[PDB]
Structure formats: C-alpha cells, structure tokens
C-alpha cells in the first residue's frame, strides 16, 4: 500500500487490498498397453523378464 502526506486539517484517506486466489482441479492420468497371452507365456518360460 501507499501512504499519503497529510496536513493537520486534511483528510486521512484509505487504500485497497490486492488479493488473487488461484485454484487447481485434480486430474487423473491413465497409461495402457495391450499385451497378448502368447507373449505372456513367452516371457515366463523363455526367461526374459520383460514385464517387471
């Protein structure tokens, strides 16, 4: 705020307060990969360790 020079008789004024509110909405994100079972058995018995 800005102060003001005031004489003995003059009027002491006022100032305004500046306030700004921000808001954020929650967002969910998804990530999907479509794997086949023929692959799933492969990484299991062929021993590659692909998924983990």
């Amino acid at each position: 705020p800005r102060a003001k020079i005031v004489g003995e008789g003059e009027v002491k004024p006022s100032a305004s307060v500046d306030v700004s509110a921000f808001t954020a909405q929650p967002i969910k994100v998804v990530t999907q990969q479509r794997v086949s079972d023929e692959f799933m058995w492969a990484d299991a018995d062929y021993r590659l360790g692909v998924l983990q």
Binding site: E38, A42, D45, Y46
Partner: protein
C-alpha cells in the same frame, strides 16, 4: 373310488450322470509319446536314408 398318488403331486428324483463313460478322445496320444516342450517353434533332426 380311492385316494391315489396323482392328487399328491410328487416332484420326483434326479440321477444326473455316470462318472465314467467311454469317450473317443484322442487316438494319437496312444501311438507316440507326448514330448512336452517350452513355448515357441520346435525344431528337430530327420534321419532319412540308409
């Protein structure tokens, strides 16, 4: 003329299935061993001539 079983409507009884019937199933499994292997294309050797 008399009291019968028709008036007393009986539900009945269930004799569903027999545990062991003869099924055709698979003949091939009888003529050669199963030779189980890992998933993936199988390759072997063929000895032909004499």
């Amino acid at each position: 003329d008399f009291l019968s079983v028709g008036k007393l409507e009986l539900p009945g009884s269930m004799i569903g299935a027999v545990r062991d019937r003869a099924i055709d199933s698979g003949v091939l499994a009888k003529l050669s061993p199963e030779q189980p292997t890992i998933f993936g294309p199988v390759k072997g050797a063929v000895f032909s001539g004499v």
